[PDB]
Amino acid sequence: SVCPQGKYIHPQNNSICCTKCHKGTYLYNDCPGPGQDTDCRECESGSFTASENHLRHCLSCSKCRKEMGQVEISSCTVDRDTVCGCRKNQYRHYWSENLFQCFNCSLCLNGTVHLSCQEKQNTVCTCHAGFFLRENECVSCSNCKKSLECTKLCLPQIEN
Amino acid sequence: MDSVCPQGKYIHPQNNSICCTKCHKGTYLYNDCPGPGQDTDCRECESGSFTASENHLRHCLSCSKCRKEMGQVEISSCTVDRDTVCGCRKNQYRHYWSENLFQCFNCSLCLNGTVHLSCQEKQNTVCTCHAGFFLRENECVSCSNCKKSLECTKLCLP
Ligand SMILES: [Mg+2]
């Protein structure tokens, strides 16, 4: 025994086919027989189900990582999980396959953009003569001092 | 901006004229350095938390927990500098409902059928059934099981 599309095989009796629960709800109890309803309860706050199903629990909403500078794009609803991301002018730096931190795309004031900021990489910015790139900005050489790793960048230029 | 630091150091939150060495991954910021030539007070992350990079976070990140109801299994446990890695069992594929949420499904074996593409890490086997069989419930079902309303009559004709 198999079931028609949209139905599932009863866990305790394989000769019974039950209709799946609508997204936004979860399986409270399997249907008791052919032509009888599957009992589906609405997901509690903080949980959801995005497709027709027969799960015994709704999924807990995903949480965004505030420490990584993440913001909530969309809030979690009974049939829609939380959507986490970054601001429009920010890019993502993945520390791992699914762990990303939001970083500001360099505006490159007093510099030349050689490659626009991308989804996963910062703007490629070349600061103009008299400035050096640090802390995502083009900083004036008048602030350069020993140990700031700027001495050579600030010395007269050389065509090497 | 005028006050900056060497790569590897961060600007002291109370005085931008002071730069402090960052904490290595696996540790977090206990206390900022008091000034030049003195250490930043960084301490190891406690049980269940981690930091994946050089930082100066006041708290470590909480490790992720694999979703058992989605049939997920732990591929790598969480360490002081690396979050837990979740996956599926052998002969199963991951169906991603979103970028960071996936469900484990069994790959179709395609018995009594033709495999066009083998099962992949994120998608099922592409299978079509031989004459006398019909695809349903991840398998090629014998047409002897075809019954009206099971949507298979025409597929089961000679
Ligand atoms: Mg910096």
UniProtKB/Swiss-Prot annotation, chain B:
Disulfide bonds join 5-19, 20-33, 23-42, 45-60, 63-78, 66-86, 88-104, 107-119, 110-127, 129-140, 143-156, 146-152. Glycans are attached at residues 15, 106, 112. TNFR-Cys repeats lie at residues 4-43, 44-86, 87-127, 128-157. Residues 2-158 are extracellular. Changing residue 36 to L: In FPF; benign. This is Tumor necrosis factor-binding protein 1. It comes from Homo sapiens. The gene is TNFRSF1A.
